[PDB]
Amino acid sequence: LDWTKIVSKLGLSGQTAAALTSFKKRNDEAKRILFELKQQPSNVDFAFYKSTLKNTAIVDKIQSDVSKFTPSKANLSKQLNLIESFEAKALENAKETESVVLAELTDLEKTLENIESXXXXXXXXXXXXXXXXXXXXXXXXXXXX
Amino acid sequence: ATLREIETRLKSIKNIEKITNTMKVVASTRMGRAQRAMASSRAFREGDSDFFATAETSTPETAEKTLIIAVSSDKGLCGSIHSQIAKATRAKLQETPNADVVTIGDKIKAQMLRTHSSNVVLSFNGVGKEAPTFWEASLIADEIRKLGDYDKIEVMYNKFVSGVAFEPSVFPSFSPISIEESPKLSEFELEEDQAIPTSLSQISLTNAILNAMAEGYASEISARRNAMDNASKNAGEMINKYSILYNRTRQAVITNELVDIITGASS
Amino acid sequence: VSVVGQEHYDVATGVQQTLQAYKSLQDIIAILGMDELSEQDKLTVERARKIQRFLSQPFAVAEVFTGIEGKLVRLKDTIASFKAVLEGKYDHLPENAFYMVGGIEDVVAKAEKIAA
Amino acid sequence: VSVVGQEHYDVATGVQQTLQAYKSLQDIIAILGMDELSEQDKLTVERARKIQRFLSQPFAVAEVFTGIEGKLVRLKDTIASFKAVLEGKYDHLPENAFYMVGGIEDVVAKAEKIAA
Amino acid sequence: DQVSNLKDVVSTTKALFEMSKETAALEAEAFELKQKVAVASEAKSVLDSWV
Amino acid sequence: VRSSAGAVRDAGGAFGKREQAEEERYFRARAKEQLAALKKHHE
Amino acid sequence: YVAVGQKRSTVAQLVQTLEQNDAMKYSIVVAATASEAAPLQYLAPFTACAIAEWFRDNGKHALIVYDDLSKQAVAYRQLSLLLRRPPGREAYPGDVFYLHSRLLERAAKMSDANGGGSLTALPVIETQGGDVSAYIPTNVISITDGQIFLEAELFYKGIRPAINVGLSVSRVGSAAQVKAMKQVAGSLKLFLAQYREVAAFAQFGSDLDASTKQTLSRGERLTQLLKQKQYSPQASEEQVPVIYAGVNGFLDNIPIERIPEFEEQFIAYLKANEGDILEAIRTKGELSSELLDKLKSATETFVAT
């Protein structure tokens, strides 16, 4: 139950504010409807309805049909629109971090360990760190654009 | 509306009438001493600032917004003293809302914060108790957070046009860059090597602040005397109406108490 | 709120709360004056005077004593006119434009004729 | 002064004069404010508020309504604590250190614990 | 920020399928409870009027 | 009437409630300055 | 319920609302309208107290409601004036204070040797313009163990019910309350007196006091959260969680208009997620060290949606 993490789960764009507010309102209304309603069928007091009705065999026939089965507004799991989009979202957003965020962590560790170290050998290692820092600066401007 | 409730309301209204009448008599004695300081400040404003009238000193284009200074007091019970000072500064800030405001009182800073809270750049408290002097005006002019880097510098105050009413006037203050760019500024023999342009604007800031504080204190003291006289007159009318209701309630209480003892003794 | 609705119940509680604050502070406005109040008390005193005169409508039987026509405001028009004046939509109008009128339609027509 | 002594008679007359003078000065503060008070009127208003709260002690039978424990002050400790506060020995202490306390020993312990 | 986006996108993708299943389960329980209460209220109102 | 010694606070109206609120507000501001000065001069 | 002095439409409307909410099966209704004789309305307090005394003497608890006490005093003076008797004060009988004190003294809590029962008395006093210094108003307030003052100023603004914290008090103290509500709201009686003096300072023009900003904002949210609607009673488990979030400062960051929606959302989340904390406050009736740490952590995480 991520409360503070679900509000900041999106990126820098504010286009996901309408989709996140509609999903949170639908989940709260569905849980409140199940708690406000009774978690049972019905009483159906046939002991005081069959002997009090004017017509003979009136309340006895209606009590047997209501306690059997009837139709209800329900659906099946055939239209799995959210299940099909879950695999495509993880393969484009979550799977992109396995090659973009992983390459940035390996390049930052190699540049920090080389720029901090004697003369000609240290200058050669600093050249590779300078090239990685220049590429990181261009990637930082592209991430904000 | 009983006998105990009418006696507590009549006794509390009588104490407020004596405090309002004593405050009006004390305001008249303070107005006589304040009249000498206001008359002396008017003669100094026409002699020290006489060089600006003969040289035609005026401003032109705006240089990084401007600067406003609302001179008032920190206490109340003065009628429409704080309402007239806040209404005059809000009308002139419509054409230039990017200018800063320097409130010189608790009454002017409370009304300006409800309309333009971001325009308040300086707040000065403790100036409405005693009378103004040259030491209070010279200390606020040197610590105004760069007061010489503005094109126009207005001083909002209350000018006492009569001895009963007043009006909110305004006086502009030129900077060092506008004093040397006048028309007839080179008519007098001034030393260009020493401080002549910067010394004219620094001396005019303390003189204009002392004249505005002296005129604002006399107008606030005159307005407080009119409000105290109106409060004492309104308390006398309420005490007369409460005395008529207390007299009728006292006669009705004696008749109701005597009717209860006469009914039980006759049965 | 179970008979008149949630919209009519909130307008009745807001109009009664503004009139109770101005009546309790009548001892300072009649002695010291209206300038002794603060910023929040000054706006509540002006809205309470206009709400008291707007509820007084001229009846049809009292046309010979008042001179104006009879106004019969409905239940839905009276709830919408009181909620708009308490929110700040009619604060620029005068206090005499709502005295002896109807709903929100008669208050806007009386203010335009008096300013011409 | 012939039953309680000359020292106890001056403490009872000094506490009654300071409490009676605070009622007349409070009426002027409700209309004019604290600006009309001088140096002697400002110190008398602060000493009258601390003397009224120091005389209220927590009873032993009223422990279910107050919460604190019951304190019992003697006759010699009550006369020594009232004479020191009227001279100027406890002017730097706050008004909450004497409220619901005992004698002079409980007022000094409550001021150091509230500042930490 | 990029590493935190991987765990957030993986959690939001699984929550989308559970939110659609929770709305269908709540609508089925509300429809069955309203249909059963309507049959019980209609039989009780007819029995109270006849008695 | 006579005996107006403390008739403002004894009424309990508009002037009586404003006098108690003005004295409580001034005593609350002075208690914060006295408690802060005693903590810095405890040793 | 002993409806004495009411009309015929008021007694029929109150009995119909209790039967629809499953509450008239264990409640005695004493019908005593004003259209009957003066002897029937005056003896309505003594007849209703005899029926409720049978349960307190056996081992059960009773609750009598004498509505109203002002109507019973007018009915006793009408029958005494027609029997050729001398009147007293305000055209009433001599034993006016003894008639109301004798009927209220019988509703007391018995000991363990008498059965262990008790009888609660709820007498309503109808005032005239808030004048509590009358003859029938001062006599009933000095015989009962506390009174609930209902002012007409706060009732019209929307604060229902208008219960003055500075006027209404209880003589029993904290002994007649539960241990769960007394722990989370131990300073509820002291916060009402401090917030009343700070609320009047906002109308004077003072905008300083940074230390008093937390107490003034928490006082306005605590008064709106305690105001409930009609026919909407709360239990001890739902009132202990609402009083702990308003006294600890957790409701100071919320808005004033969202105080009504925050009460329904906090009670619904505690019944489906952390249901073990709500059942422990109702069964045990108190909160130890483990119950105080679990209630503070759940209230802080629920404030951010």
GROMACS .gro file of N, CA and C in nm, chain A residues 71-135:
model
  195
   71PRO      N    1  -3.037  -1.304  -1.212
   71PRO     CA    2  -2.929  -1.236  -1.284
   71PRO      C    3  -2.873  -1.119  -1.204
   72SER      N    4  -2.748  -1.085  -1.234
   72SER     CA    5  -2.679  -0.975  -1.168
   72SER      C    6  -2.586  -0.907  -1.267
   73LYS      N    7  -2.561  -0.778  -1.243
   73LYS     CA    8  -2.473  -0.698  -1.329
   73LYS      C    9  -2.329  -0.735  -1.298
   74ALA      N   10  -2.277  -0.833  -1.372
   74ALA     CA   11  -2.140  -0.879  -1.354
   74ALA      C   12  -2.078  -0.904  -1.491
   75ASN      N   13  -1.947  -0.931  -1.490
   75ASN     CA   14  -1.874  -0.958  -1.613
   75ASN      C   15  -1.766  -1.061  -1.585
   76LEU      N   16  -1.702  -1.107  -1.692
   76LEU     CA   17  -1.596  -1.206  -1.684
   76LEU      C   18  -1.460  -1.139  -1.707
   77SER      N   19  -1.355  -1.221  -1.705
   77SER     CA   20  -1.219  -1.174  -1.725
   77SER      C   21  -1.171  -1.193  -1.869
   78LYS      N   22  -1.264  -1.191  -1.965
   78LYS     CA   23  -1.227  -1.208  -2.105
   78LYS      C   24  -1.166  -1.081  -2.162
   79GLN      N   25  -1.223  -0.965  -2.129
   79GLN     CA   26  -1.173  -0.836  -2.177
   79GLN      C   27  -1.060  -0.788  -2.086
   80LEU      N   28  -0.944  -0.851  -2.101
   80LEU     CA   29  -0.826  -0.818  -2.021
   80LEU      C   30  -0.747  -0.707  -2.089
   81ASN      N   31  -0.803  -0.586  -2.080
   81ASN     CA   32  -0.737  -0.470  -2.140
   81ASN      C   33  -0.620  -0.422  -2.055
   82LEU      N   34  -0.635  -0.427  -1.922
   82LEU     CA   35  -0.528  -0.383  -1.833
   82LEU      C   36  -0.420  -0.490  -1.818
   83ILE      N   37  -0.454  -0.617  -1.840
   83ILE     CA   38  -0.355  -0.723  -1.828
   83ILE      C   39  -0.263  -0.725  -1.949
   84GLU      N   40  -0.317  -0.693  -2.067
   84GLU     CA   41  -0.234  -0.691  -2.187
   84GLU      C   42  -0.143  -0.569  -2.190
   85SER      N   43  -0.187  -0.456  -2.134
   85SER     CA   44  -0.105  -0.336  -2.132
   85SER      C   45  -0.001  -0.338  -2.021
   86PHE      N   46  -0.012  -0.432  -1.926
   86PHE     CA   47   0.085  -0.439  -1.818
   86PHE      C   48   0.218  -0.496  -1.866
   87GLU      N   49   0.213  -0.591  -1.960
   87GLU     CA   50   0.337  -0.649  -2.012
   87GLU      C   51   0.408  -0.554  -2.107
   88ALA      N   52   0.332  -0.473  -2.182
   88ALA     CA   53   0.394  -0.378  -2.273
   88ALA      C   54   0.452  -0.258  -2.201
   89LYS      N   55   0.395  -0.221  -2.086
   89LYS     CA   56   0.448  -0.107  -2.011
   89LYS      C   57   0.578  -0.144  -1.940
   90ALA      N   58   0.589  -0.267  -1.892
   90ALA     CA   59   0.712  -0.310  -1.825
   90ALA      C   60   0.824  -0.336  -1.925
   91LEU      N   61   0.790  -0.366  -2.050
   91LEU     CA   62   0.890  -0.391  -2.153
   91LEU      C   63   0.941  -0.264  -2.218
   92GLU      N   64   0.877  -0.150  -2.193
   92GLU     CA   65   0.919  -0.023  -2.251
   92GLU      C   66   0.967   0.078  -2.148
   93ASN      N   67   0.911   0.077  -2.027
   93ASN     CA   68   0.950   0.169  -1.921
   93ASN      C   69   1.040   0.103  -1.817
   94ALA      N   70   1.000  -0.013  -1.764
   94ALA     CA   71   1.081  -0.082  -1.665
   94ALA      C   72   1.201  -0.151  -1.728
   95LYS      N   73   1.185  -0.202  -1.850
   95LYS     CA   74   1.295  -0.269  -1.919
   95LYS      C   75   1.396  -0.170  -1.976
   96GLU      N   76   1.359  -0.044  -1.993
   96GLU     CA   77   1.453   0.055  -2.046
   96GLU      C   78   1.558   0.092  -1.943
   97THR      N   79   1.528   0.077  -1.814
   97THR     CA   80   1.624   0.109  -1.709
   97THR      C   81   1.734   0.004  -1.696
   98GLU      N   82   1.714  -0.115  -1.753
   98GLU     CA   83   1.816  -0.219  -1.746
   98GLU      C   84   1.934  -0.191  -1.838
   99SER      N   85   1.917  -0.100  -1.935
   99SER     CA   86   2.024  -0.065  -2.028
   99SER      C   87   2.062   0.082  -2.025
  100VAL      N   88   1.973   0.170  -1.979
  100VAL     CA   89   2.004   0.313  -1.973
  100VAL      C   90   2.057   0.352  -1.835
  101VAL      N   91   1.990   0.308  -1.729
  101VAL     CA   92   2.036   0.340  -1.594
  101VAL      C   93   2.157   0.256  -1.557
  102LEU      N   94   2.169   0.136  -1.613
  102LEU     CA   95   2.285   0.052  -1.584
  102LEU      C   96   2.411   0.104  -1.653
  103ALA      N   97   2.397   0.160  -1.773
  103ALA     CA   98   2.513   0.214  -1.843
  103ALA      C   99   2.560   0.344  -1.780
  104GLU      N  100   2.469   0.422  -1.721
  104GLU     CA  101   2.508   0.546  -1.655
  104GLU      C  102   2.579   0.520  -1.523
  105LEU      N  103   2.542   0.412  -1.453
  105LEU     CA  104   2.608   0.381  -1.327
  105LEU      C  105   2.748   0.326  -1.348
  106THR      N  106   2.769   0.249  -1.455
  106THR     CA  107   2.902   0.197  -1.483
  106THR      C  108   2.996   0.305  -1.536
  107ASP      N  109   2.943   0.401  -1.611
  107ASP     CA  110   3.026   0.510  -1.662
  107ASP      C  111   3.061   0.610  -1.554
  108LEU      N  112   2.972   0.632  -1.456
  108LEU     CA  113   3.002   0.725  -1.348
  108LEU      C  114   3.102   0.666  -1.250
  109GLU      N  115   3.101   0.534  -1.231
  109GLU     CA  116   3.197   0.471  -1.140
  109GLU      C  117   3.336   0.465  -1.201
  110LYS      N  118   3.346   0.446  -1.333
  110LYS     CA  119   3.476   0.441  -1.398
  110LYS      C  120   3.539   0.580  -1.411
  111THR      N  121   3.457   0.684  -1.425
  111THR     CA  122   3.510   0.819  -1.436
  111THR      C  123   3.551   0.876  -1.301
  112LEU      N  124   3.480   0.839  -1.194
  112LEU     CA  125   3.515   0.888  -1.061
  112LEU      C  126   3.642   0.823  -1.007
  113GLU      N  127   3.664   0.695  -1.039
  113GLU     CA  128   3.783   0.625  -0.993
  113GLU      C  129   3.907   0.657  -1.075
  114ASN      N  130   3.891   0.717  -1.193
  114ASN     CA  131   4.004   0.753  -1.278
  114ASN      C  132   4.044   0.899  -1.266
  115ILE      N  133   3.948   0.989  -1.245
  115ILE     CA  134   3.980   1.131  -1.232
  115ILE      C  135   4.040   1.164  -1.096
  116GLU      N  136   4.015   1.082  -0.995
  116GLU     CA  137   4.068   1.106  -0.861
  116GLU      C  138   4.208   1.050  -0.842
  117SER      N  139   4.262   0.979  -0.941
  117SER     CA  140   4.396   0.923  -0.930
  117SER      C  141   4.494   0.995  -1.022
  118UNK      N  142   4.987   0.883  -1.200
  118UNK     CA  143   5.030   0.996  -1.118
  118UNK      C  144   5.051   1.121  -1.203
  119UNK      N  145   5.114   1.102  -1.319
  119UNK     CA  146   5.141   1.213  -1.409
  119UNK      C  147   5.085   1.185  -1.548
  120UNK      N  148   5.162   1.111  -1.628
  120UNK     CA  149   5.120   1.076  -1.763
  120UNK      C  150   5.013   0.968  -1.761
  121UNK      N  151   5.022   0.878  -1.663
  121UNK     CA  152   4.925   0.770  -1.649
  121UNK      C  153   4.793   0.822  -1.594
  122UNK      N  154   4.800   0.925  -1.510
  122UNK     CA  155   4.681   0.985  -1.451
  122UNK      C  156   4.610   1.074  -1.553
  123UNK      N  157   4.687   1.130  -1.645
  123UNK     CA  158   4.631   1.217  -1.749
  123UNK      C  159   4.557   1.135  -1.854
  124UNK      N  160   4.603   1.012  -1.876
  124UNK     CA  161   4.540   0.923  -1.973
  124UNK      C  162   4.407   0.871  -1.920
  125UNK      N  163   4.400   0.851  -1.789
  125UNK     CA  164   4.278   0.803  -1.726
  125UNK      C  165   4.177   0.916  -1.709
  126UNK      N  166   4.228   1.039  -1.703
  126UNK     CA  167   4.143   1.157  -1.689
  126UNK      C  168   4.080   1.195  -1.823
  127UNK      N  169   4.142   1.149  -1.931
  127UNK     CA  170   4.092   1.177  -2.065
  127UNK      C  171   3.963   1.099  -2.092
  128UNK      N  172   3.957   0.977  -2.040
  128UNK     CA  173   3.839   0.892  -2.056
  128UNK      C  174   3.727   0.939  -1.963
  129UNK      N  175   3.765   0.998  -1.850
  129UNK     CA  176   3.668   1.049  -1.754
  129UNK      C  177   3.609   1.181  -1.803
  130UNK      N  178   3.688   1.256  -1.878
  130UNK     CA  179   3.643   1.384  -1.933
  130UNK      C  180   3.543   1.362  -2.046
  131UNK      N  181   3.563   1.253  -2.121
  131UNK     CA  182   3.474   1.219  -2.231
  131UNK      C  183   3.341   1.167  -2.179
  132UNK      N  184   3.346   1.099  -2.065
  132UNK     CA  185   3.226   1.045  -2.002
  132UNK      C  186   3.147   1.156  -1.934
  133UNK      N  187   3.218   1.257  -1.885
  133UNK     CA  188   3.154   1.370  -1.819
  133UNK      C  189   3.088   1.462  -1.922
  134UNK      N  190   3.146   1.467  -2.041
  134UNK     CA  191   3.092   1.549  -2.149
  134UNK      C  192   2.966   1.486  -2.206
  135UNK      N  193   2.963   1.353  -2.207
  135UNK     CA  194   2.847   1.280  -2.257
  135UNK      C  195   2.734   1.282  -2.155
   0.00000   0.00000   0.00000
